[PDB]
Symmetry: C2
Subunit: 255 residues, 2 copies
């Protein structure tokens, strides 16, 4: 009845965040890195369909996936590489926040989503900076101890963001909703040596919805934010409006 | 007041689905492919952050993005490559459905999501097969004519799935919610010439929620499915449960 954890991330088997978390979890659970071989912060919920995947296994046992996305890593971990199957997926600790409408772009979150059907809700854990990995590890371990203490009935993935603060300064925990940003609009051009313009994706838009119940607000104020996530992208509140619109413009109806 | 459309997809500037749609839209709108240079059905909402992006432009004007994901293509299209800015993003026609809980993995949908802040709701259009691109083009054009006829008040992206049927056999339109599947669990091993096991991601799980109001049910029955989507992954119905759970297990509270 020791927890079997598939530990993945967005930064690969080596990032200090995953290495720090690995050390911490091994104190009380059996841990298998199934993680990328190398930075996939771009990756979102991408996965490899047109190619087979190769691993490689470091001397310390860190199962790793060549050119693997975080979702690839977790899918292979759960369905092939782990035996017996993991009880839970943990993804992190990510160096940097995964907050607001950024979460759909997050590989850290994606790895957790890929573990959503396991016995325990998956955890994605992101540190709001690069200093206090131990704070994020302590928060993760508390959550894991909670799950063993008592099952979480509703909510299949928890998106956890930890303030980059010494643990003593973390004020508590807040259950939050995702905030949002204004549209990101910047493109940074840079010419190559031959004078061709290449384009970088610019920084995220300014915060739009960062009210007190948001993940943004909780982290800014020094709380751990926990947002339950799901994968259903249906905008349920739009249903009647879209239906009425179609009727009004006569699309899909003769009359 | 002719519509300016940024047309992208998951399959690149050339896939017959985008080429067929391009031909159809140009009859009444100004169209710029900003699309990948080549198949990115793996891509989901991935985007390129650690590298700059290079384009290339075919003789027919098809702006294309080297190693570009669908989100890269739309972001660059909207913010840099299109002038004046597009009025709307259209992504498709995809060869194959984007239904249920697959939509978070879909590059076609991702390209549309990336156009969600424009004046008109973005459209992702997927054909449930590879035959009747003209059917999907006709449905797309009807929707676009609807949007010009009257603005859609709520709902920022519409995920459209078209039955792979001659238009005359399409029964109508249904506003739907996303269905879901059982966990996908298959991994297909295949050895390389040196005897190393490589792993393919297997097929999706069996359908779980495919009730009549679902996108799955509508398409199966020969209707166009239109699901309004958003990017907020918050599982709002889990809030109280997670809060109560934390209190119960004493995580985040001293008492
Ligand atoms: Mg990262
Ligand atoms: Mg595709």
């Amino acid at each position: 009845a020791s927890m079997r954890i598939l530990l993945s991330n967005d930064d690969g088997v080596h990032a200090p965040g995953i290495q720090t978390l690995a050390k911490a979890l091994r104190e009380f659970a059996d841990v298998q890195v199934v993680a990328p071989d190398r930075n996939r912060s771009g990756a979102s919920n991408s996965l490899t369909l047109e190619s087979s995947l190769r691993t490689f296994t470091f001397d310390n046992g860190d199962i790793a996936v060549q050119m693997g996305t975080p979702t690839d890593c977790v899918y292979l971990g759960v369905n092939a590489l782990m035996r017996p199957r993991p009880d839970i997926v943990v993804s992190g600790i990510n160096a940097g926040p995964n907050l607001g409408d950024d979460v759909i772009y997050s590989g850290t979150v994606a790895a957790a989503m890929a573990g959503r059907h396991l016995g325990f809700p998956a955890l994605a854990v992101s540190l709001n900076g690069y200093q206090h990995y131990d704070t994020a590890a302590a928060v993760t371990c508390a959550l894991l101890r909670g799950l063993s203490r008592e099952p979480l009935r509703t909510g299949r993935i928890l998106n956890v963001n930890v303030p980059d603060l010494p643990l003593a300064q973390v004020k508590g925990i807040r259950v939050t909703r995702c905030g949002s940003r204004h549209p990101a609009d910047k493109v940074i051009p840079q010419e190559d040596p031959r004078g061709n313009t290449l384009y970088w994706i610019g920084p995220p838009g300014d915060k739009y919805d960062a009210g007190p119940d948001t993940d943004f607000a909780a982290v800014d104020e020094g709380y751990v934010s926990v947002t339950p996530l799901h994968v259903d992208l249906t905008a349920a509140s739009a249903h009647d409006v879209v239906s009425d619109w179609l009727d009004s413009v006569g699309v899909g109806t003769q009359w």
